[PDB]
Structure formats: C-alpha cells, structure tokens
Design a protein around this ligand. Structure first.
Ligand code: ANP
Ligand code: MG
Length: 518
C-alpha cells in the first residue's frame, strides 16, 4: 500500500528518510534540522520532544535521555505530573513518543498519512530489544515492515548489495552515546554480521565531557576553586558549549568557548572566554578515541579474515566527522580509504528508506550518470532516427547539425526527439516534440534549420531549432537501470532486422524534417 519511511531511532539523535522520485530524501524537522534529539521532556502535562527537550535536559528533571539503553528491559522511568503525582513510563512508550514526533512532521512535509516504517537497531540487539523497538513503532501507529541492523542499513545506503560479488565490509559506528564496529558479509542480497564488538557507554557525549572538565578546570583556576557542578542552568550551558566547541574543532584548529554570566559571586559576574585548540582537545580525548582501536582488530579476528580482505569501510555516526577518528580508522586498514561520502549521521536512515522502497516494490531508484547511456536522435524523413548525441558521450555537451525541409514549400518543421539505439524513430522512446514555423516558401532541401542538442552537467536535455534565414527559433527542455537495459535489449534483439534497415539509410547527405498535422 502506502509509503514506507526509514527511521534511525538513535540513542542520541533520530533521523527520518523516505524515497521520493527514486532517491532517498532526509526530512527536516520543524526547526529545520535533519536529525532530531532522542529526548522527551514533560512540563505542564505537555510532552516535549527533540530540540526543545534537549535545551532543558539538565534544568528540567522530567527529561528522559538515552531511553534506548533501557529498551528490551522491564525498567520504568518516573516523571512528575503537574500536580506532583508520579507517572511510570516504559521504554516502549517513550520511544513511541519520539517515533510519533518524527512520523507527524514527516506526514506534514510529504502531505500524506504514513502508517508503515522500516526501523533500524544495533547489530547486537537481541529479540527482547528488537521487539521493544517494534512495539514502540506499533504504539506510534506504524506497521513495522522490517527491523534491520544499523550497519546493514549503512551498507544499503552505499549500494553495496549491488556489487555482484561477495563483499566483506567494516562498519565503524561512533555516535553520541555508543560505539560499534561490525564486519558484514554481503553476497547475493544476503547480509550476515560475521562479528560485532563495541561499547554502549562510549560516544561523542564522552568527548563533550572532557571539554566540560577542561572548562571546569579553567573556571576553578581563575576563580579560587569555583565549582558549578551543582548549578543546573550553568551545567546546561556548559554541555551545550562543549558540544558546539567540539563540532567547530572538526573544521577549525581552535575554537573559543564563550559563556558570559555563567554565575555571579560576591566579586561579580563570572564570564568565560576560553580557547581550546584541536591539539589540546585530541590530547584530552585520546583515551576515549583509543578505546575504539582494539575492537577493530577483534572483529577482523572473530570473522576469521585478514585486514587486506576487507573490501570496503564505512564511517557511520556524527562523531566520525572528527579528523582523529578518520585517521585512526585509516591507520587500521592500510591501503583502504574509509567511506564517509554519505552524511554519517543520516546514512542509517537513508538505508532504512531504501529498504522501505524495496519492500513497497516501487523499483524506481534512478541513476546519476556522467556519460549518456543511450543515443539521442531527431526524427528525419521516413521516420528515421538521426543521431545528434551518440551513446556514451560525457556530459555536459552540446552538438549541432543543420537540416532542411522534406517537402517543397514547407512552412514548418516538426522536431521529434527520441532516445534509443534503433534506426527507426518509432522503435525508440519518444522524449517529446515541438514545431518551428515561419519558414519562407522554397524547394525541399533549400531551407536551413540549425538543430542543437545540449546536455548540462545535471543531464537535462535542451533541444533548440533555429531557422538560419528568418532567425526564428523554438526549443524544449526534457524533464532507471531497468529501462536502460530494456532499450539496449530491444536493439540487441532486433540487431539483424535493423542492419537491413540501416542498409537503406544514408545519413551523410543533409537530413530533412517533415511536418504532419496533429
Ligand atoms: N561535525 C561534528 N564533529 C564532531 N562530532 C559531531 C559532529 N556532528 C555531530 N557530532 C556528534 O555526533 C554525535 C551524534 O551522532 P549520531 O550518529 O547523530 O547519534 P546516534 O545515531 O544517536 N548514535 P548513538 O548515540 O551511539 O546511538 C554527537 O555526539 C554529536 O555531537
Ligand atoms: Mg545513527
């Protein structure tokens, strides 16, 4: 039936994607963000999800952070109601509020009701943890069409199932809260996790916490041991400044932590303006980073392969944007370049969306080529396909040829554009047509009409026709692996018939364009 959205339900952040026009699109939340914090808060008996919850996660004690850690268990989380009574919530219920929020903004963005999803989980998730996640989906009104592993979703996003060979893929995933490295075997559409190793208390939060310690040490040095660890608002600001500083250090060699009026003492306002260099940050966080190294070696050994047998390495998770992380992974597989070309905080959701598209059976996923797959032609006298841009021409490109009229005293020319390898235009795919009129009366072969086929870097086709005497011109702009193969097959299947046709066709004299009333 309807669309199947792909959901990465992360410990720290969540992300929702869907197939639109044969490409996966990541949907922005109402604050314009492509990921949403996996945080739920409660105030005045109102449920607050995402960015607005994160902004009060220290200051509002009703805030539920890292609920994914309790998924698959019978633990309950307590929150206070407005009246001071206590409410108990299951991990399923809290996760369902995150899913409902994603679902709601997805619906408003797409403009349709959504009732189906593919939801991702860590490779290590057992049945209790997977079933908890499925139940969360059900509570949010989503038929959970499949639960897939996060590294499997990443591999799907990178098209690794299209390799037509056995692929051994290392997926290094460093998120906000968790670290995983999984070794996948991918052959004939089957994904097997050969090994998974990691730490669910090691992620970007821990790097932030080292910056918090650095700021705190500076504060104490500059203000006689001043300690804000029990000041909730100050700690809210420190956590946010620390994450911001870290993110800047992925693109800068230094950053300034700016916290005016962090508190006020008897002596006055405490204003922090503190430099942190990338080098210092890396030194402080070295023990955290180094905890991710041995597990790489461990999964390779578990899978009973050598490092040189790894075909591809994928970087997943927002923390893999850190230069020290990328360099560490590179160091562990000499001669292989880790892939991070798909935004690593979106790649899992993208893979989930791709899986959704597959399960729906839409089969629409288009290609993005830098060379023309099929020949582009104009219809000439007798229904002949006269080529303008030959197949396998690198785009962008413009090609021109001059044509004449097919009949004496012809007033206009039809410009019929077709795609395919067959010699008769009717046997190829019609891409569109237009007419160019105002041609002055003359014998057939006398008028001269310049035809130009132009393909831009985006692969969009502009066909222009200019009468070289009158200077009048008209044009049009023209708006799938299986369809390309179907057309090549049609030519292959009629090769002998078409050769006989071609033997009657001489393209070397000036071509002529007909006009037929419609
Ligand atoms: N440019 C960047 N540089 C450094 N860290 C970043 C960057 N962008 C995002 N992050 C961090 O990436 C982490 C979030 O990763 P993300 O993959 O979105 O979380 P997740 O999928 O919930 N994984 P987990 O928390 O392990 O379940 C946070 O610690 C962010 O601060
Ligand atoms: Mg993720």
């Amino acid at each position: 039936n309807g669309l199947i959205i792909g959901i990465d339900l992360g410990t720290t952040n969540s992300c929702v994607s869907v197939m639109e026009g044969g490409r996966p699109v990541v949907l922005e939340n109402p604050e314009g963000k492509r990921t949403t914090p996996s945080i739920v808060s409660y105030k005045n008996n109102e449920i607050i999800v995402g960015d607005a919850a994160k902004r009060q996660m220290v200051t509002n004690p009703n805030t539920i952070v890292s609920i994914k850690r309790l998924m698959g268990t019978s633990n309950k989380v307590k929150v206070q109601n407005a009246d001071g009574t206590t409410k108990e919530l299951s991990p399923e219920q809290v996760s369902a509020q995150i899913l409902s929020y994603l679902k709601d903004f997805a619906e408003k963005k797409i403009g349709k009701k959504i009732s189906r999803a593919v939801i991702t989980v860590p490779a290590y998730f057992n049945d209790a943890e997977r079933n908890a996640t499925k139940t969360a989906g059900k509570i949010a009104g989503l038929n959970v069409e499949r639960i897939i592993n996060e590294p499997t979703a990443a591999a799907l996003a990178y098209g690794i199932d299209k390799a037509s060979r056995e692929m051994k893929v290392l997926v290094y995933d460093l998120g906000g809260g968790t670290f995983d490295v999984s070794l996948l075997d991918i052959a004939e559409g089957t994904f097997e996790v050969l090994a998974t190793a990691g730490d669910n208390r090691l992620g970007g939060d821990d790097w932030d916490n080292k910056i918090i310690e650095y700021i705190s040490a500076y504060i104490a040095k500059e203000h006689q041991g001043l300690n804000l660890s029990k000041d909730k608002m100050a700690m809210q600001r420190l956590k946010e400044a620390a994450e911001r500083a870290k993110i800047e250090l992925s693109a800068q060699l230094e950053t300034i932590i700016s916290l005016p009026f962090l508190t006020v003492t008897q002596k006055g306002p405490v204003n922090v303006e503190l430099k942190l260099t990338r080098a210092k940050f890396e030194e402080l966080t070295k023990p955290l980073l180094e905890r991710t190294r041995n597990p790489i070696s461990d999964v390779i050994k578990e899978a009973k392969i050598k490092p040189e047998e790894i075909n591809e390495i994928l970087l997943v998770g927002g923390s893999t944007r850190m230069p020290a992380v990328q360099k560490l992974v590179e160091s562990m597989v000499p001669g292989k370049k880790p892939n991070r070309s798909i935004n690593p905080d979106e790649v899992v959701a993208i893979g989930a969306a791709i899986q959704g598209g597959v399960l729906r059976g839409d089969v629409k996923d288009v290609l993005l080529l830098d060379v023309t797959p099929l020949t582009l032609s104009i219809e000439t006298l007798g229904g002949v396909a006269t080529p303008l841009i030959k197949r396998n021409t690198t785009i962008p490109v413009s090609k021109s040829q001059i044509f004449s009229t097919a009949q004496d005293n012809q007033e206009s020319v039809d410009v019929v554009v077709c795609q395919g390898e067959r010699p008769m235009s009717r046997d190829n795919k019609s891409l569109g047509r237009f007419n160019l009129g105002g041609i002055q009366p003359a014998p057939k072969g006398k008028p001269q009409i310049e035809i130009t086929f132009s393909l831009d870097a985006n692969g969009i086709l502009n066909v222009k026709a200019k009468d070289l005497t009158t200077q009048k011109e008209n044009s049009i702009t023209i708006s799938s692996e299986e369809e390309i193969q179907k057309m090549i097959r049609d030519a292959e299947a009629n090769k002998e018939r078409d050769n006989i046709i071609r033997e009657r066709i001489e393209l070397r004299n000036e071509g002529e364009l007909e006009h037929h009333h419609h």
